[PDB]
Design an enzyme around this catalytic site. Structure first.
Site, mmCIF file in Angstrom:
data_model
loop_
_atom_site.group_PDB
_atom_site.id
_atom_site.type_symbol
_atom_site.label_atom_id
_atom_site.label_comp_id
_atom_site.label_asym_id
_atom_site.label_seq_id
_atom_site.Cartn_x
_atom_site.Cartn_y
_atom_site.Cartn_z
ATOM 1 N N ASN A 64 -4.676 -7.066 1.806
ATOM 2 C CA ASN A 64 -5.145 -6.341 3.712
ATOM 3 C C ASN A 64 -6.543 -7.998 3.795
ATOM 4 O O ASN A 64 -7.112 -7.789 3.111
ATOM 5 C CB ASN A 64 -5.892 -5.370 3.182
ATOM 6 C CG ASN A 64 -5.180 -4.542 3.341
ATOM 7 O OD1 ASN A 64 -4.945 -3.769 4.964
ATOM 8 N ND2 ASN A 64 -4.605 -3.848 2.454
ATOM 9 N N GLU B 194 1.116 -1.304 -0.264
ATOM 10 C CA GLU B 194 0.070 0.246 -0.157
ATOM 11 C C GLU B 194 1.278 1.519 0.218
ATOM 12 O O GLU B 194 1.907 0.994 0.336
ATOM 13 C CB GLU B 194 -1.394 0.392 0.806
ATOM 14 C CG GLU B 194 -0.384 0.231 2.641
ATOM 15 C CD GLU B 194 -0.986 0.208 3.883
ATOM 16 O OE1 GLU B 194 -2.063 -1.305 3.659
ATOM 17 O OE2 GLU B 194 -1.936 1.199 3.772
ATOM 18 N N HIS C 234 -1.347 -6.919 10.665
ATOM 19 C CA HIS C 234 -2.074 -8.255 9.992
ATOM 20 C C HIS C 234 -1.991 -9.666 10.978
ATOM 21 O O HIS C 234 -1.521 -10.414 9.787
ATOM 22 C CB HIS C 234 -1.901 -8.036 8.208
ATOM 23 C CG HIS C 234 -2.051 -6.674 8.590
ATOM 24 N ND1 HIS C 234 -1.661 -6.825 6.637
ATOM 25 C CD2 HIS C 234 -3.060 -6.395 8.431
ATOM 26 C CE1 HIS C 234 -2.498 -5.786 6.703
ATOM 27 N NE2 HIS C 234 -3.256 -5.260 7.510
HETATM 28 C C1 LIG Z 1 -4.041 -0.117 12.056
HETATM 29 C C2 LIG Z 1 -3.889 -1.172 12.105
HETATM 30 C C3 LIG Z 1 -4.303 -1.127 10.309
HETATM 31 C C4 LIG Z 1 -4.851 -2.433 9.382
HETATM 32 N N1 LIG Z 1 -5.368 -1.516 8.201
HETATM 33 C C5 LIG Z 1 -6.385 -3.066 7.361
HETATM 34 C C6 LIG Z 1 -6.855 -2.187 6.223
HETATM 35 O O1 LIG Z 1 -6.670 -1.107 5.507
HETATM 36 N N2 LIG Z 1 -8.179 -3.658 5.591
HETATM 37 C C7 LIG Z 1 -7.614 -5.248 6.723
HETATM 38 O O2 LIG Z 1 -8.064 -5.744 5.466
HETATM 39 N N3 LIG Z 1 -7.210 -4.781 7.653
HETATM 40 C C8 LIG Z 1 -6.863 -4.230 7.876
HETATM 41 N N4 LIG Z 1 -6.493 -4.053 9.451
HETATM 42 C C9 LIG Z 1 -6.068 -5.654 9.406
HETATM 43 C C10 LIG Z 1 -7.614 -5.839 10.294
HETATM 44 O O3 LIG Z 1 -8.120 -4.779 10.926
HETATM 45 C C11 LIG Z 1 -8.084 -6.790 11.779
HETATM 46 O O4 LIG Z 1 -7.404 -8.082 9.775
HETATM 47 C C12 LIG Z 1 -8.998 -7.381 11.510
HETATM 48 O O5 LIG Z 1 -9.940 -6.483 12.817
HETATM 49 C C13 LIG Z 1 -9.111 -9.333 12.527
HETATM 50 O O6 LIG Z 1 -10.206 -9.537 12.884
HETATM 51 P P1 LIG Z 1 -10.639 -9.223 13.419
HETATM 52 O O7 LIG Z 1 -13.030 -10.760 13.548
HETATM 53 O O8 LIG Z 1 -10.494 -11.318 13.860
HETATM 54 O O9 LIG Z 1 -10.914 -9.071 15.080
HETATM 55 P P2 LIG Z 1 -10.706 -8.124 15.938
HETATM 56 O O10 LIG Z 1 -10.934 -7.398 14.928
HETATM 57 O O11 LIG Z 1 -9.142 -8.220 16.380
HETATM 58 O O12 LIG Z 1 -11.530 -8.094 17.281
HETATM 59 C C14 LIG Z 1 -11.179 -8.651 18.151
HETATM 60 C C15 LIG Z 1 -11.730 -7.995 19.367
HETATM 61 O O13 LIG Z 1 -12.365 -9.363 20.280
HETATM 62 C C16 LIG Z 1 -11.740 -8.016 21.870
HETATM 63 N N5 LIG Z 1 -10.977 -9.414 22.416
HETATM 64 C C17 LIG Z 1 -10.053 -9.596 22.273
HETATM 65 N N6 LIG Z 1 -9.635 -10.581 23.309
HETATM 66 C C18 LIG Z 1 -11.071 -10.914 24.120
HETATM 67 C C19 LIG Z 1 -11.301 -11.481 25.265
HETATM 68 N N7 LIG Z 1 -10.818 -12.264 26.006
HETATM 69 N N8 LIG Z 1 -12.399 -11.211 25.664
HETATM 70 C C20 LIG Z 1 -13.292 -10.290 25.109
HETATM 71 N N9 LIG Z 1 -13.149 -9.654 24.076
HETATM 72 C C21 LIG Z 1 -11.918 -9.937 23.562
HETATM 73 C C22 LIG Z 1 -10.799 -6.910 21.083
HETATM 74 O O14 LIG Z 1 -10.726 -5.659 22.128
HETATM 75 C C23 LIG Z 1 -11.853 -6.964 19.466
HETATM 76 O O15 LIG Z 1 -12.251 -5.883 19.856
HETATM 77 C C24 LIG Z 1 -5.592 -3.305 10.241
HETATM 78 C C25 LIG Z 1 -5.141 -3.543 11.674
HETATM 79 C C26 LIG Z 1 -4.491 -2.521 12.011
HETATM 80 C C27 LIG Z 1 -4.191 -2.718 13.489
#
Ligand SMILES: Cc1cc2nc3c(=O)[nH]c(=O)nc-3n(C[C@H](O)[C@H](O)[C@H](O)COP(=O)(O)OP(=O)(O)OC[C@H]3O[C@@H](n4cnc5c(N)ncnc54)[C@H](O)[C@@H]3O)c2cc1C
Length: 500
Positions: free
Chosen positions: A479, A357, A441
């Site tokens: 992403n 990117e 990621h």
């Molecule tokens: C700065 C940054 C920029 C990014 N940019 C992009 C982008 O532009 N496009 C893209 O495709 N991806 C991007 N990503 C990655 C994307 O955000 C993640 O891949 C995605 O959010 C993961 O989804 P998920 O459902 O696996 O978990 P997450 O979205 O990480 O959600 C996990 C949730 O569970 C909660 N949690 C964790 N442990 C516990 C617990 N024990 N008890 C209860 N709650 C808990 C956490 O607080 C969180 O709210 C980026 C990430 C970051 C940090």
């Protein structure tokens, strides 16, 4: 809000992409659903009357239980300051392991609160190679479209892109990439681009054009609380319990699972502990959060029968960040949107398979820096393992494992440097050229069809399901969030029609 002693039919741990999909599909099927989220709901204004803080002057709302603000770019011409803050339940968690820092969003919406909104569907050919057990026809005919539509994906007006000063940095990055024979591509996003035009016209409050992204967006960005979670809440069957950290999951007596959680106040102090019983539990705590939980439960004898594969195959989506110095005729602009819209796609090249990117560095002044976050096809993986001594889950990833990714990125950027006669910046991160100590990621840890069955079920414990990034085998070449959402859509479809 959940109370000690409660018995609930379905409990979703975490509210990021996987969790929001699980919650929407369960409630639409008529099943009352509880989400438990460790972070706060971001729907209450702070001191300044805004929900989130910006990046140029961050405050305690920026970080999850930390003493300093942080992001990858460090103290570069005013941008990326490390200001002392009070410990607070802020939005961005810089979670430190021994060999890598894993940035994660905390709050209702998870990573959607803090991410760049880039919504990319992976290349079918690569998808078919890395997830061979998944019917790719269903994915491309149905689940990927369902995900993109549910997420509110849209594309930037290309005529507006060409003319606006806010994307000059992207045009400069496109120019030097193309001069070296590299392909560039627009990247779809959940940020409302129609709203962005109005920001540029000065008609609406600036967010993406106002130094906001990594600590949240006060406007424009369609985070999950505005899409999937709003739709799940509209059913009237969703309950969200915030500021509760799940710490333990074990079989209950008779049936279901005992779920232990720590309630915390806004300063991170544990104020109470509760145990609720759930018939079905959906792990959606993220690649790191779900992996830590399951690896601990197995090691501590609570879910001793989990697969040996639990904890295996974690990857970092080959993340490498780097910056190059442009000559004076290739300015990147003092006005930069915080939302990237263009990348360099060299994934097809076996010798330097990267998708980079072209990232903004919205410092508000002319720096001449072209900044890039590269996804590289780094084969290296690591595992999570319970540390008996410390009682904590360690991640075995070593910083040296990023070397293969740097070598791949270097092949592309060295060529552009040679053509343009430019050098890399060495001052964006301690005299380092390559940002190789963090990932945005995290992927893997509980691989689909390895640690789980082909639909995310933990077969040894009926009623336990995994629906998040822990399912993905370490790298998807783009992403990740669209892939996580589409996999979740696929899995929930099957589980609801088959199991429930
Ligand atoms: C700065 C940054 C920029 C990014 N940019 C992009 C982008 O532009 N496009 C893209 O495709 N991806 C991007 N990503 C990655 C994307 O955000 C993640 O891949 C995605 O959010 C993961 O989804 P998920 O459902 O696996 O978990 P997450 O979205 O990480 O959600 C996990 C949730 O569970 C909660 N949690 C964790 N442990 C516990 C617990 N024990 N008890 C209860 N709650 C808990 C956490 O607080 C969180 O709210 C980026 C990430 C970051 C940090």
């Amino acid at each position: 809000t959940l109370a000690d002693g409660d018995r609930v039919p379905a409990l979703v741990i975490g509210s990021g992409y996987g969790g929001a999909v699980a919650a929407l599909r369960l409630t639409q099927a008529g099943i009352p659903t509880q989400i438990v989220e460790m972070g706060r709901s971001w729907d209450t204004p702070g001191s300044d009357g805004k929900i989130f803080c910006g990046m140029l002057n961050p405050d305690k709302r920026s970080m999850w239980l930390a003493d300093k603000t942080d992001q990858p770019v460090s103290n570069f011409m005013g941008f990326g300051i490390n200001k002392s803050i009070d410990r607070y339940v802020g939005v961005l968690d810089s979670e430190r392991f021994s060999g890598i820092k894993v940035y994660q969003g905390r709050g209702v919406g998870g990573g959607s609160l803090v991410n760049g909104g880039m919504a990319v569907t992976p290349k079918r050919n690569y998808f078919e190679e890395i997830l061979p057990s998944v019917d790719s026809n269903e994915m491309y005919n149905k689940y990927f479209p369902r995900a993109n539509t549910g997420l509110g994906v849209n594309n930037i007006d290309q005529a507006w892109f060409e003319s606006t000063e806010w994307y000059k940095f992207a045009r400069t990055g496109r120019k030097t990439a193309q001069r070296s024979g590299f392909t560039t591509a627009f990247v779809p996003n959940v940020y409302d681009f129609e709203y962005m035009k109005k920001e540029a016209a000065g008609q609406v409050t600036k967010s993406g054009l106002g130094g906001e992204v990594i600590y949240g967006n006060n406007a424009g960005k369609k985070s999950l609380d505005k899409t999937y979670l709003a739709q799940a809440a509209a059913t009237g069957k969703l309950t969200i319990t915030t500021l509760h950290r799940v710490t333990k999951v074990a079989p209950a007596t008779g049936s279901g699972y005992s779920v232990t959680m720590e309630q915390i106040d806004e300063q991170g102090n544990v104020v109470a502990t509760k145990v609720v019983t759930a018939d079905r539990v959906f792990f959606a705590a993220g690649s790191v959060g779900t992996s830590k939980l399951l690896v601990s439960m197995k090691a501590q004898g609570h879910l001793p029968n989990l697969s040996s594969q639990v904890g295996e195959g974690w990857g970092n989506n080959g993340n490498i960040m780097v910056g190059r110095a442009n000559h004076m005729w290739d300015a990147t602009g003092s006005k930069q949107a915080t939302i990237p819209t263009m990348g360099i796609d060299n994934w097809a090249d076996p010798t330097a398979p990267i998708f980079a990117e072209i990232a903004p560095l919205p410092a508000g002044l002319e720096t001449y820096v072209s900044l890039y976050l590269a996804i590289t096809k780094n084969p290296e993986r690591a595992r999570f393992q319970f540390n008996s001594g410390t009682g904590k889950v360690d991640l075995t990833w070593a910083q040296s494992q990023n070397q293969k990714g740097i070598d791949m990125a270097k092949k592309v950027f060295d060529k552009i440097n040679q053509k343009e006669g430019t050098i890399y910046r060495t001052d964006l991160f301690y005299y380092k050229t390559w940002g190789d100590d963090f990932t945005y990621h995290p992927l893997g840890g509980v691989l689909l069809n390895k640690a789980t069955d082909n639909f995310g079920r933990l077969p040894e414990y009926p009623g336990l399901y995994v629906v998040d990034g822990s399912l993905v085998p370490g790298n998807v070449g783009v992403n990740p969030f669209v892939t996580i959402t589409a996999l979740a859509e696929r899995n929930m479809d099957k589980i609801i029609s088959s199991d429930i």
